[PDB]
Amino acid sequence: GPAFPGMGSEELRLASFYDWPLTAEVPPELLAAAGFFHTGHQDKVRCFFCYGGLQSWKRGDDPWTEHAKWFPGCQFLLRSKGQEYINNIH
Ligand SMILES: CN[C@@H](C)C(=O)N[C@H](C(=O)N1CC[C@H]2CC[C@H](NC(=O)C(c3ccccc3)c3ccccc3)[C@H]21)C(C)(C)C
Ligand SMILES: [Zn+2]
Known part of the structure; x- marks a missing residue:
């Protein structure tokens, strides 16, 4: 199962980015879609x-590329994007 089941909802993850400092540079919508929530500290x-x-x-x-680059064994990543996607990034 997930490490942090409470952030399994994409909408809750998106809400966490209310004070994200890089909106134009790295969109919260894409970060949230890719499984990420904002810790509240820096980026x-x-x-x-x-x-x-x-x-x-x-x-x-x-965000999806970075997810697959650094955490290729993530099962949320696998379920969402498939093995071919992960393999191609490597
Ligand atoms: C250029 N694109 C970005 C998304 C990137 O590649 N980031 C790398 C990154 O953040 N990584 C690479 C894979 C991880 C291991 C090293 C780094 N981890 C952390 O920074 C975490 C951390 C460790 C120790 C002290 C403070 C923070 C971390 C923990 C929680 C949230 C975010 C980061 C994570 C970096 C900084 C090495 C360029
Ligand atoms: Zn993951």
Whole structure:
């Protein structure tokens, strides 16, 4: 199961980005869709399922790409995007 079942809802994850500092650079909509919620500190986010944390986001970063790059074993990622997607990023 998920590390943090309470953030399994995409809408709850999106709400967590109310004070996100990088709206134009890395959209909250895409971060939330990709399993991430905002910790509230700087640009630190975490996936609700694998609990993997990512920070130091660069403008134009693709949240799903970064998810697969750093946490390829995440089952939410696999369920959502499929194995071919994960394999191609590697
Ligand atoms: C350029 N795109 C971004 C999304 C990126 O690749 N970020 C990397 C990243 O954040 N990573 C890579 C994979 C993870 C391991 C190293 C880094 N982890 C953290 O920064 C976490 C952390 C560890 C120790 C002290 C403070 C923070 C972290 C924890 C919770 C939330 C966010 C990050 C995570 C970085 C900083 C190494 C370029
Ligand atoms: Zn994950």
